[PDB]
Swiss-Prot record, chains A, B:
GO terms for molecular function: metal ion binding; tRNA-guanosine(34) queuine transglycosylase activity. The keyword tRNA processing applies. Its cofactor is Zn(2+). The gene is tgt. Binds 1 zinc ion per subunit. The lineage of its organism: Bacteria, Pseudomonadati, Pseudomonadota, Alphaproteobacteria, Sphingomonadales. This is Queuine tRNA-ribosyltransferase. It comes from Zymomonas mobilis subsp. mobilis (strain ATCC 31821 / ZM4 / CP4). GO terms for cellular component: cytosol. GO terms for biological process: queuosine biosynthetic process; tRNA wobble guanine modification; tRNA-guanine transglycosylation. Belongs to the queuine tRNA-ribosyltransferase family. It catalyses: 7-aminomethyl-7-carbaguanine + guanosine(34) in tRNA = 7-aminomethyl-7-carbaguanosine(34) in tRNA + guanine. Its EC number is 2.4.2.29. It holds the Pfam family TGT. The active site is at residues 79, 249.
Length: 352, 352
């Protein structure tokens, strides 16, 4: 029987790591990409904010929880709901769907995630806007740390959750090294199963994001998983792994799949462009996915230009699969001691 | 090696028949439902009118024909293009996509279908509008019969087509028995591999459609397949099989699948309705399809209400599968001598 939560590092190269998270419902290979569940992956995401509004967390619990609802028996991660949605108590807001009132606090966020039944629960934080002044970044981060302690206590009070799920704390501090250090220290003093780097992928751009990761990731406990929230494009993932990140989520593969953009080893392509109308190659020449085994760029182009749902489905399947092939190549290259070369080769081709 | 075309009737009950069409690319079990190819089925449809406009028949031929383009190596049926789109020569029209000029005549329709590479080719006809006066129905049907002879001659002139594909003639005559008889006689004198009943499912309603089928289907050669174009809802299919029809096509399973409607043995349901929000049963209680094996009405409701493409995909998979299960039950019941009872039981439950 697997443990509630156990992270093991099997191999390292520079700051990059590869290993496994063992949980009751399954093993998660890291570095991991975690796709949206409503889109192979070891863990999927539930969309807390959306589920709060439709059908509501209590209704999901009545239907048996998200694993039963979605037909997925392996681990599920949920966000805490606030990024998606003010006072020291929490945040209040009205639903556009039916005008109903909703409050969100650390305690209510943890209870919502309990009712959804997720395996990895995020602490309730404030994703500081970018740019932020030092003073506003500090007061925001300080509130998030008080909220992290409240999240910890709420999670620990619910026996089923404490014994079967895991809780991640979220580092804030904007782009400021001293605030990132204070946030890391506060989270480690509380104690979490994993640590997310929050407050990035909010408009700062890759150079600044990587600069912040350079000093921020080493501040977190080395022996616990590191989750970069909201990232990202394939090259963002590669560079973040080089800086010690173990877990990723991003709306891009599905959003791109519905808007005509396919990820390939030679960079993204917009399949609706006329240059693909007679292209008999698969979406990607090396991709092992079922779409690239059977259908051409020309046919996918045709389906999407015709408005056929099949086209969007095939694009999404391809993009999700590409992301998982990327993560597999990352894991194998770290394990084999050739991740530095992989990253260099990946970039040369992706940006050529 | 299978023949170019061979229809065999294995069993009969009343006017209903079950059997097989053997063609070079596969066997088609009848009665058959023929789904749109861009949506198990033995034959799929190509959309001639759409393909003429995007990317064009010549471009499809350059890409290897529809079988290669769509990744489907079994039989394909194409329409002749005119219903979808005037003089004795044919019809002229301008494309809304790019303003280009397109002519359509019996000869050009057959050439388009040749370039697409379809296995069952429809003669180029005029689908008479409904209602029609006797005089207008007669002059329309007479033109269609002249066009049927031109279609036959064009098909026979193209060696690859004549030796490897099949040609169906289309009966017209609106709702008038004498014109339906004249049309049947003219088509049989020309000679076709199969015979379609055209000019129905154009607003006349089920009672009138069945009345016309009652006298029209017996006029066609008994030993050849009978295709009712544009039909239809499940109860239309059952009643048409009772009247001697062997083949069907209809936009409903896919159109309904994209608009929230699911077919079930207890009738159609609109899965977006709030009454399904907590319904843990599968879409249909008896359906063997993968969707009903894994997911609930409540989850499909949620996906479609959320705008997720996955929901539309699952609804479409379910509807296509339901149609093929219906056809399998029809074939088995005729073969077993219990189709009369099946039709009675089907209607009692579908309309309860
Ligand atoms: C884009 N840059 C981006 N996204 C950040 C999310 C949201 C993650 C959430 O982002 C979407 O929701 C809105 C996703 O829905 C499509 C969720 O997956 C279902 C995902 O939950 C893990 C952050 N969440 C928290 N709690 N705190 C953060 O500091 C943070 C930073 C992010 N940067
Ligand atoms: C609804 N009532 C309906 N549809 C009739 C179609 C069109 C069939 C065609 O109907 C859609 O195109 C428009 C389908 O596209 C969704 C085509 O499948 C791809 C399908 O081709 C077999 C008829 N076609 C011809 N040539 N002649 C007819 O008399 C006729 C009668 C129909 N009644
Ligand atoms: Zn692929
Ligand atoms: Zn089903």
């Amino acid at each position: 029987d697997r443990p509630r939560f156990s992270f093991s590092i099997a191999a390292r190269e520079g700051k990059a790591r590869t290993g496994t998270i063992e949980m009751k419902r399954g093993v998660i290979r890291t570095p991991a990409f975690m796709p949206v569940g409503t889109a192979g992956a070891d863990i999927i995401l539930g969309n807390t904010y959306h589920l709060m509004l439709r059908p509501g967390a209590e209704r999901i619990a009545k239907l048996g929880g998200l694993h039963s609802f979605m037909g997925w028996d392996r681990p599920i991660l949920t966000d805490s709901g606030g990024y998606q949605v003010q006072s020291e108590e929490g945040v209040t807001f009205k639903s556009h769907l039916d005008g109903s009132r909703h409050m969100l606090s650390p305690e209510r966020s943890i209870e919502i995630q309990h009712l959804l039944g997720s395996d990895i629960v995020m602490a309730f934080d404030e994703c500081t806007p970018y740019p932020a002044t030092p003073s506003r970044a500090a007061s925001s981060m300080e509130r998030s740390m008080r909220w992290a302690k409240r999240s910890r206590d709420a999670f620990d009070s619910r026996k089923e959750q404490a014994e079967n799920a895991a809780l991640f704390g979220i580092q804030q501090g904007s782009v400021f090294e001293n605030l990132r250090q204070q946030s890391a220290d506060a989270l480690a003093e509380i104690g979490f199963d994993g640590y997310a780097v929050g407050g990035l992928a909010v408009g700062e751009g890759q150079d600044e994001m990587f600069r912040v990761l350079d000093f921020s990731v080493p501040m977190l406990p080395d022996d616990k998983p590191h989750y970069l929230m909201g990232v990202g494009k394939p090259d963002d993932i590669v560079g973040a792994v080089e800086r010690g990140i173990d877990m990723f989520d991003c709306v891009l593969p599905t959003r791109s799949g519905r808007n005509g953009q396919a990820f390939t080893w030679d960079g993204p392509i917009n399949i609706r462009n006329a240059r693909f109308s007679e292209d008999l190659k698969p979406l990607d020449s090396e991709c092992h996915c079922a779409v690239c085994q059977k259908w051409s760029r020309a046919y996918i182009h045709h389906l999407i230009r015709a408005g056929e749902i099949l086209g969007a489905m095939l694009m999404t399947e391809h993009n999700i699969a590409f992301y998982q092939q990327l993560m597999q190549k990352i894991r194998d290259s770290i394990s084999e001691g050739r991740f530095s070369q992989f990253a260099q080769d990946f970039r040369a081709r992706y940006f050529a």
